[PDB]
Design a protein around this motif. Structure first.
Motif, PDB file in Angstrom:
ATOM      1  N   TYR A  34       0.782  -1.285   0.010  1.00  9.97           N
ATOM      2  CA  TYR A  34       0.118  -0.155   0.014  1.00  9.97           C
ATOM      3  C   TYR A  34       0.791   1.293   0.049  1.00  9.97           C
ATOM      4  O   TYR A  34       1.747   1.424   1.123  1.00  9.97           O
ATOM      5  CB  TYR A  34      -0.824   0.165   1.153  1.00  9.97           C
ATOM      6  CG  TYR A  34      -1.798   1.160   1.572  1.00  9.97           C
ATOM      7  CD1 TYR A  34      -2.155   2.145   0.655  1.00  9.97           C
ATOM      8  CD2 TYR A  34      -2.366   1.395   2.723  1.00  9.97           C
ATOM      9  CE1 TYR A  34      -2.786   3.228   0.842  1.00  9.97           C
ATOM     10  CE2 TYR A  34      -3.290   2.306   3.019  1.00  9.97           C
ATOM     11  CZ  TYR A  34      -3.219   3.322   2.057  1.00  9.97           C
ATOM     12  OH  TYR A  34      -4.107   4.441   2.489  1.00  9.97           O
ATOM     13  N   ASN A  35       0.871   2.031  -0.934  1.00 10.59           N
ATOM     14  CA  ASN A  35       1.918   3.187  -1.416  1.00 10.59           C
ATOM     15  C   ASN A  35       0.884   4.404  -1.374  1.00 10.59           C
ATOM     16  O   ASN A  35      -0.384   4.484  -1.911  1.00 10.59           O
ATOM     17  CB  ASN A  35       2.454   3.035  -2.508  1.00 10.59           C
ATOM     18  CG  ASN A  35       3.324   4.109  -2.487  1.00 10.59           C
ATOM     19  OD1 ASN A  35       4.299   4.191  -1.800  1.00 10.59           O
ATOM     20  ND2 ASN A  35       3.582   4.508  -3.933  1.00 10.59           N
ATOM     21  N   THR A  57       2.883   9.145   4.034  1.00  9.42           N
ATOM     22  CA  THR A  57       3.924   8.291   4.683  1.00  9.42           C
ATOM     23  C   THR A  57       5.255   8.960   4.746  1.00  9.42           C
ATOM     24  O   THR A  57       6.322   8.548   5.664  1.00  9.42           O
ATOM     25  CB  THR A  57       4.031   7.119   3.967  1.00  9.42           C
ATOM     26  OG1 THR A  57       4.540   7.394   2.772  1.00  9.42           O
ATOM     27  CG2 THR A  57       2.821   6.180   3.942  1.00  9.42           C
TER      28      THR A  57
END
Ligand SMILES: [Cl-]
Ligand SMILES: [Cl-]
Ligand SMILES: [Mg+2]
Lengths: 291, 291
Positions: free
Chosen positions: B133-134, B139
């Motif tokens: 999951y990008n 992030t």
């Protein structure tokens, strides 16, 4: 109150990843002898992310023990959950930390009002001086100067580590605050300029490997001696760049291993500095007179 | 293998933040009735960050219990520590989850090789289907298409949620993988586009409030019917925008509250949707025929 060169200390680890208590104790002693003014235990550079809650408590406990009241110790107690930040911050208070450093909640992107409520809940829950920490490139969130200025009005909120490296913006924050809380640089490349502009110190990566140099840069910059700050900072300027060739603390931990001060342990998802960067990093240390 | 509309389900909470178990059961039931094809439990929209370890397990167990194998349940098990991710992923396997969804480590910014080792270590430790999951904006790190392509070679790595919203890059990723693992949209605004180009589904926020319409959008878009995909997505296109007027899941929880389906609970540092956005939200819901 806390001023000067504040090292964001690494957490030395054995090859298998275990905390290297012997090396840590030696590193704290060396910082004290070389002129470091304060230590942040278990912040980003100290791999807060991959240490367990018991490991946070133990690293803070050991650093306080070895320091033996000679310099203030600041505990990194940030979390992206308010409830968790409270528990961490309470534990640091009970360990006898002098202050806590609390990065803005990362990943979950709270609003500015959510940032305000998060820090105010912590300030109201734990009687301990708290230092805000803004590093938008890592967190996904930017604690605006306006929100910082509001939070400075909350009892127990005593400063902010500004890692934006944006000097006009940090000057604007210092001027707006007019003393109501401290501003610390969180960007070694521009810290000398922020101190010349009224910042109270530099919560520094570079001080891990050049503690005596960074203690001098901070003293002269706090003293408002622009030429001395420029000249002293210039000697270590290349270190401020090379310590971020891969994400900190990857390079600084490699630098300390090249200095013979720690072993190679670093915890996944972090990795020892890529092989290709080790020679250039050695050359920078040699140029700087460190090895 | 899992295809279609995969709701990133909220975790309903009481006014005081306690998990609202009855309202969660009702939501899981309504999704199944409405045509939702799978549920991600305790993902970003589910407030993974602010739920305790025991609550992460209870929520997973409750969604699994209520779904009673009618649709696959994917457990959010990401962490920014590889050790902690392995623990959460093992727990999800043990609870009976069909797959796990693991966001890239956030905040500590690993290198591309550290991201590769992180997910390789998890895949080798836990025999369970893993979806990468990008979402680089949250992030602070971007798992490149090249790294994703290497990881698709690893056995139990079975897909990726690409939340970049960058359609040409997602198309390049689909093309480079040539079927080796699945691509799921993580961007409601572009999801219909990415599925027409070959994505296996949409791990969707909008599906929380329009589960039937998004089920139908995914099905016609996966069928490669470009006209019907566009037509159907137009009816809900303004919802994709309004559900991000403050950080998700702030707007979506408020929406489910206006729909009479959950209470206003949401955990600091997130806050209830700011008043100024509530009337526009309510109008968007009325416009879409949801209320
Ligand atoms: Cl720090
Ligand atoms: Cl998710
Ligand atoms: Mg990411």
């Amino acid at each position: 109150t806390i001023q000067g060169s504040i090292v964001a200390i690494v957490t030395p680890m054995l090859k298998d990843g275990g905390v290297d208590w012997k090396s840590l104790e030696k590193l704290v002693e060396w910082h004290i002898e070389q002129g470091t003014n304060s230590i942040v235990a278990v912040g980003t550079t100290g791999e807060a992310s991959t240490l367990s809650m018991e490991e946070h408590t133990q690293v803070i406990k050991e650093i306080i023990r070895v320091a033996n009241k000679r310099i203030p110790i600041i505990a990194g107690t940030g979390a992206n959950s308010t409830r968790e930040a409270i528990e961490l911050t309470k534990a640091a208070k009970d360990l006898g930390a002098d202050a806590a450093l609390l990065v803005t909640p990362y990943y979950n992107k709270p609003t500015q009002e959510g940032l305000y409520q998060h820090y105010k809940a912590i300030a109201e829950a734990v009687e301990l001086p708290l230092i805000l920490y803004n590093v938008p490139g890592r967190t996904g969130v930017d604690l605006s100067n306006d929100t910082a200025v509001r939070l400075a009005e909350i009892p127990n909120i005593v400063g902010i580590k500004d890692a934006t490296g944006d000097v006009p913006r940090g000057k604007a924050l210092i001027d707006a605050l007019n003393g109501k809380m401290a501003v610390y640089s969180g960007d070694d490349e521009t810290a000398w300029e922020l101190m010349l502009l009224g910042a109270d110190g530099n919560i520094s990566v570079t001080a891990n490997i050049a503690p005596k140099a960074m203690s001098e840069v901070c003293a002269v910059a706090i003293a408002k001696d622009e030429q001395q700050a420029k000249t002293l900072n210039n000697k270590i300027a290349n270190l401020h760049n090379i310590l971020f060739c891969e994400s900190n603390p990857i390079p600084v931990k490699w630098a300390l291993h090249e200095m013979g001060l720690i072993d190679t342990g670093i915890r996944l998802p972090l990795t020892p500095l890529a092989e290709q960067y080790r020679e250039p990093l050695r050359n920078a240390l040699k140029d700087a007179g460190i090895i």
